[PDB]
Amino acid sequence: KRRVVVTGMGMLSPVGNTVESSWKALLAGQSGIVNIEHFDTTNFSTRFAGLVKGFDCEQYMSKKDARKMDLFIQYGIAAGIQALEDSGLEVNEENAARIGVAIGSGIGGLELIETGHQALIEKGPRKVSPFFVPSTIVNMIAGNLSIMRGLRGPNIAISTACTTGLHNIGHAARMIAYGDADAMVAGGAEKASTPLGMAGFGAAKALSTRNDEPQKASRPWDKDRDGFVLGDGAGIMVLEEYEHAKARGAKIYAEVVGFGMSGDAYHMTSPSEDGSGGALAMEAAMRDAGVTGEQIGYVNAHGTSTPAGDVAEVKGIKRALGEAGTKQVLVSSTKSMTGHLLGAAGSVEAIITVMSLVDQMVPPTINLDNPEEGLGVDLVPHVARKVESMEYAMCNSFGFGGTNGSLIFKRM
Amino acid sequence: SKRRVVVTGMGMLSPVGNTVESSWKALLAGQSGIVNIEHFDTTNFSTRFAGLVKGFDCEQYMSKKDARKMDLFIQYGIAAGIQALEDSGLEVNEENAARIGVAIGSGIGGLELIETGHQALIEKGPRKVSPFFVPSTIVNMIAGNLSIMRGLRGPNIAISTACTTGLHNIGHAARMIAYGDADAMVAGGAEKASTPLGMAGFGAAKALSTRNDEPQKASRPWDKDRDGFVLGDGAGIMVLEEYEHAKARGAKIYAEVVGFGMSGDAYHMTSPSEDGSGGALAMEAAMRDAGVTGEQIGYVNAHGTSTPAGDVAEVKGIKRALGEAGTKQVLVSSTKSMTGHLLGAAGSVEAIITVMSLVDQMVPPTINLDNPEEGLGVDLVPHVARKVESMEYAMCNSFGFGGTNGSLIFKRM
Numbered sequence: 001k002r003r004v005v006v007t008g009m010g011m012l013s014p015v016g017n018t019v020e021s022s023w024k025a026l027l028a029g030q031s032g033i034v035n036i037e038h039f040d041t042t043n044f045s046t047r048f049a050g051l052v053k054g055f056d057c058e059q060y061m062s063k064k065d066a067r068k069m070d071l072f073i074q075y076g077i078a079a080g081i082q083a084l085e086d087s088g089l090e091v092n093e094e095n096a097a098r099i100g101v102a103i104g105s106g107i108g109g110l111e112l113i114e115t116g117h118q119a120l121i122e123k124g125p126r127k128v129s130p131f132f133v134p135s136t137i138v139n140m141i142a143g144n145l146s147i148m149r150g151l152r153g154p155n156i157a158i159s160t161a162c163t164t165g166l167h168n169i170g171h172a173a174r175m176i177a178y179g180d181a182d183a184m185v186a187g188g189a190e191k192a193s194t195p196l197g198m199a200g201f202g203a204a205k206a207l208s209t210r211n212d213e214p215q216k217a218s219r220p221w222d223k224d225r226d227g228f229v230l231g232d233g234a235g236i237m238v239l240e241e242y243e244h245a246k247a248r249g250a251k252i253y254a255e256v257v258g259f260g261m262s263g264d265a266y267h268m269t270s271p272s273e274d275g276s277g278g279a280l281a282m283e284a285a286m287r288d289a290g291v292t293g294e295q296i297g298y299v300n301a302h303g304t305s306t307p308a309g310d311v312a313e314v315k316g317i318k319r320a321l322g323e324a325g326t327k328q329v330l331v332s333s334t335k336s337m338t339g340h341l342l343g344a345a346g347s348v349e350a351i352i353t354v355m356s357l358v359d360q361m362v363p364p365t366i367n368l369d370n371p372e373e374g375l376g377v378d379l380v381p382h383v384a385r386k387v388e389s390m391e392y393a394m395c396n397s398f399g400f401g402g403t404n405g406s407l408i409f410k411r412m
Numbered sequence: 413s414k415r416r417v418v419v420t421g422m423g424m425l426s427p428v429g430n431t432v433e434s435s436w437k438a439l440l441a442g443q444s445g446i447v448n449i450e451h452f453d454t455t456n457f458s459t460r461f462a463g464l465v466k467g468f469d470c471e472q473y474m475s476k477k478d479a480r481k482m483d484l485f486i487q488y489g490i491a492a493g494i495q496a497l498e499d500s501g502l503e504v505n506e507e508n509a510a511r512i513g514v515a516i517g518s519g520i521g522g523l524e525l526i527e528t529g530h531q532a533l534i535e536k537g538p539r540k541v542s543p544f545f546v547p548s549t550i551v552n553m554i555a556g557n558l559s560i561m562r563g564l565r566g567p568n569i570a571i572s573t574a575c576t577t578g579l580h581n582i583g584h585a586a587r588m589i590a591y592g593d594a595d596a597m598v599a600g601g602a603e604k605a606s607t608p609l610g611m612a613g614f615g616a617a618k619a620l621s622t623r624n625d626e627p628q629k630a631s632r633p634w635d636k637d638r639d640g641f642v643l644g645d646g647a648g649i650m651v652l653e654e655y656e657h658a659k660a661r662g663a664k665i666y667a668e669v670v671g672f673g674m675s676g677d678a679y680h681m682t683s684p685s686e687d688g689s690g691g692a693l694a695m696e697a698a699m700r701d702a703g704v705t706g707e708q709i710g711y712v713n714a715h716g717t718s719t720p721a722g723d724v725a726e727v728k729g730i731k732r733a734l735g736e737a738g739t740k741q742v743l744v745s746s747t748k749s750m751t752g753h754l755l756g757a758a759g760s761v762e763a764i765i766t767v768m769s770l771v772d773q774m775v776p777p778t779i780n781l782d783n784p785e786e787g788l789g790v791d792l793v794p795h796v797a798r799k800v801e802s803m804e805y806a807m808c809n810s811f812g813f814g815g816t817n818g819s820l821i822f823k824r825m
Contacts, residue, residue, distance in 0.1 A: 006564035132613035143814015155676030159572035199538035249793035263559040263568030401556015
């Protein structure tokens, strides 16, 4: 049985442009939510988002190359390079076919799609960019990173809305376990904070409209929550077969021990009232890892700050973990601080789950001023928590269409 | 003892038919599905034709209420998914729902509704954008809607890998069943990119044939006068099942999924490796997975999109992976000659075609192959279908933008 470990991590988030800076901000309870400044938001119901601060494309590639990539792709490349450099993995002629990429996005290149459609309508088909398709479609983070870094192993992109980053990591682990690859660069990226993105989620009434206090808008499980807060970013892990990593003396952050999947099969945007779908995914991941509820010290919850979603997930956690597990576990949502990073949520949060094991510290759910009644779990309100002898931690992503995933990591 | 994975249901909408059976018959007859675009004004477009699904009736497969919230690519995927499920006879109940999942994607998703949403935004502002904008357009919503409609609570995934989408979904669905995450999976892909922006975007890249005078002759894989691909729409879905589970409920079994391989060219954003090596890697991995050699593969359903650079490279890759192609023991053909390139659905429509080749011991042709390039050295099944004998294994390849490559191998029962 081939074991899979985490050897490299990289991140751009609303609270920092590295893993280390982001983690420090999260433990400090810092929000990354700000007013949108790049377009006129007057007619929009929501005027704020978790934005990546001070991204310079020219640092990573030429302006000529960047003209060929929507920002979501630029972000994913930046995180991917970070994670690769963090891992120290050397790619050469001999191993290139054993190192691949599993990276996606939930929506892809909305800004360049908008720009292409405008060109079409204004000046006709001949004025659409020759790079329209490669610049916008969701598999092109994997595509471009593979090309840039010589990675010839399996090349995939899962695109499962909010679950995207989590699925990519899980399947990357599966492919290494199976023998298709010895290492994988995996995760997700998103930059949906565009006019059409904000308008589309707004029209669904899915976003908080707390425009007066953007940093208090994201408040998972709080009685006054009123929808999620959209954020942009990228989270990438380098995953590696254990013996390969052990054999080269690798610094190893954690082991990927469980991956579970399910579908709510309930509703397009609302989760199962009973939380059973999320429970299935958690239960499958626990079976995969061969652990019981009591062994899971921390769950980095999906917790997006929606009325229906937040409650259902707690019911599902309680089912999956059982009585004894539920008594001792900590649960928190870092979307309280970052917002909901969509295609990057699941991978950013997987990195956070790993760091909780590495540092034996659990970040808070901020803004949890007045929790709903009857939750019956410790939601780590307001401030970080030191833990002791935490050996396993779990992260959940539950996306639109009922697509659910859970990963379990083991301390290393 | 690996958990064996078999095909127990198939469904399809294509430019040449709205069922597997009608499509397969048209393909064996060499019939083209390429027609002029009538649904928008194509005057200013360099390419004015496409492989269109004819007479699609959404009400055949779902309610109008369901369909309201869906771009056509989703409607097409749901229609094929329902077809395949009904073809499999798989009964979903409270006891098995958590063991039956979905792996379906698209390469581009809901371009039409994205266009419509952007138009609304620009004309009348954000408040005029549809409340269903996001669920109607994003690529994981075929999986999402089918799961919801049919009570499928097993793993729910959507791989989106451009041209390789349909194939990757089927392969990973097989992997997940093999691994134990599910006992059955509904898998494949769908696309409806024949929209103003879709046609404009591929046109601007000079990726499409511009043979507007003779749309049915435009798609001509490996022919000297090929001038880019012909875009088509559709959906292809398979129900996959664990072999013992399939036997135990009395499933119809079409074929066995025995090999799945993947690689990346790592060469260029849109051009394939000149040497075809990336495709070869994927083929080779699939052959190792299946434990077969070149001699055992009777047929390769090629990616063969009718592009100058792509078609030649793939043959070099096939010859590397499979010795016996070059000695004409392995037949190779591109059904994109008839359907066009169905993008996110290409890989799964073609998987179905590869399965039917094993079921009926017949291989469909590459039409329009009037003047092949020199030095190919393989049997490209030009013009007319081929009866075969004792074909036990057949392979299908998809090689997409960004250099993403996949290969599947099926075994006859």
